[PDB]
Write a protein that binds this ligand. Structure first.
Ligand SMILES: Cc1cc2nc3c(=O)[nH]c(=O)nc-3n(C[C@H](O)[C@H](O)[C@H](O)COP(=O)(O)O)c2cc1C
Ligand SMILES: Cc1cc2nc3c(=O)[nH]c(=O)nc-3n(C[C@H](O)[C@H](O)[C@H](O)COP(=O)(O)O)c2cc1C
Ligand SMILES: [Cl-]
Ligand SMILES: [Mg+2]
Ligand SMILES: [Mg+2]
Lengths: 221, 225
């Protein structure tokens, strides 16, 4: 698979945490729809797809976010596209929530017979397997983990088509939460902010990428 | 160059459609050593918050150890025995990824090559980030789950990369934490409390094709502002 592998690893080395984008270079509609598709097609635990990708293009709303997003001071103004990745809350992804039943039926096409058992399994899984019901936050964080699959996928896919990105956690939750809630974007408590991601074209190449040695992050048994 | 661009997108989306949660692999078909090294590299090269790389990829090839895990991994009953390669993705614990931990200092100095003024500032930023920005110090588990989120980036990447080279996978959360934790602890895999289990992933070759993939319509998971 030598050619494919090289192309992919070149994209992994292309992708970096871009701090500033070219404000005059926009990702095409087609390319951005492809990036979003890699998010949409991502896998998720129990197939629940507990995410929403909010594409904030409005400059004024970006600036509202920027006040409380220390990690995106240049990324927010300059990005071609800027995404808030939301995750479902306990309201919607506790085992007995209506969202789960509707998703399994309407999206996953899971028969009613089958979903009864699947939701019973989900219940035991959340309570006793992974202890996800420890708190409402524990359960949100579980949903949020699924969103990080989508995050990783979207950034990598972007890089493979020559589009830079930057994942962003550097924000003040309390303030971002309020802003999104008041804007309506959390859908009556269905969602909360998980992670942000900018997309666009770099202005300068970065310094060489650094990572742990393979022997320090891989072990064979 | 436009056709090539379009073909890159097509081939990637084909891989996204190829990848599925494979329930059973072919026990007679192994991923090559070279192919699996590539898959691991996509994990290693993944980004992480604060660059901390708070993961370990444990490749469990030993069939007896797989079987020990199987007892307590309801979500991998056929995947454990049949997979070509099986990975336990571990995440760093509070011991190592709280702002004031030695792991962070060493990582910033030796991997990230920061001079001390820069790492001191970075660690100060990390402290405020954990305490007050994202409230990660609510509990040891809050902090662990933050490290675990980073590992899900690597999980996603590895599975997608595998699919791009025709290798099936299955992500796995369906396990009893208490028992898996003990099994890995007793084997020495958690490195004296440095790590805990985050998520599992199997790799190999399918034995049958899945049913069509289902996902939410794009208009229901994307909103423009
Ligand atoms: C983090 C995670 C954990 C999962 N755990 C299991 C599991 O234990 N066993 C399993 O068979 N499938 C597992 N799944 C697979 C999901 O059910 C599957 O990804 C989802 O329904 C979407 O289907 P697809 O991956 O075939 O596209 C898991 C998925 C993810 C992302
Ligand atoms: C979830 C996540 C959150 C991050 N938050 C920020 C951020 O707020 N601002 C920033 O400039 N970089 C941010 N980073 C980028 C990391 O510092 C960077 O990914 C890491 O040092 C590895 O470098 P690379 O991505 O350039 O390969 C974040 C990374 C991840 C994965
Ligand atoms: Cl366009
Ligand atoms: Mg246009
Ligand atoms: Mg062609």
């Amino acid at each position: 698979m030598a050619d494919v592998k090289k192309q992919i690893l070149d994209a992994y080395n292309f992708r970096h945490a871009t701090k500033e984008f070219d404000p005059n270079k926009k990702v095409s509609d087609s390319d951005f729809e492809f990036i979003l598709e890699t998010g949409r097609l991502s896998p998720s635990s129990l197939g629940l797809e507990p995410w929403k990708f909010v594409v904030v293009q409005n400059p004024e709303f970006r600036e509202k976010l920027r006040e409380y997003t220390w990690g995106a001071q240049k990324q927010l103004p300059t990005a071609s596209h800027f995404v808030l990745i939301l995750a479902r809350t306990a309201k919607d992804i506790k085992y007995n929530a209506d969202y789960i039943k509707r998703h399994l039926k309407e999206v996953k096409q899971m028969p009613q017979d089958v979903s009864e058992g699947y939701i019973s399994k989900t219940e035991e899984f959340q309570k006793n397997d992974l202890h996800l019901l420890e708190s409402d936050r524990t359960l949100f964080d579980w949903a949020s983990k699924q969103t990080y699959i989508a995050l990783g996928n979207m950034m990598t896919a972007a890089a493979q088509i020559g589009v830079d990105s930057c994942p962003i956690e550097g924000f003040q939750y309390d303030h971002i939460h309020r802003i999104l809630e008041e804007e309506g974007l959390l859908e009556n408590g269905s969602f909360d902010i998980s992670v942000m991601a900018a997309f666009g074209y770099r202005v300068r190449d970065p310094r060489p990428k650094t990572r742990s040695a393979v022997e320090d992050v891989v072990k064979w048994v």
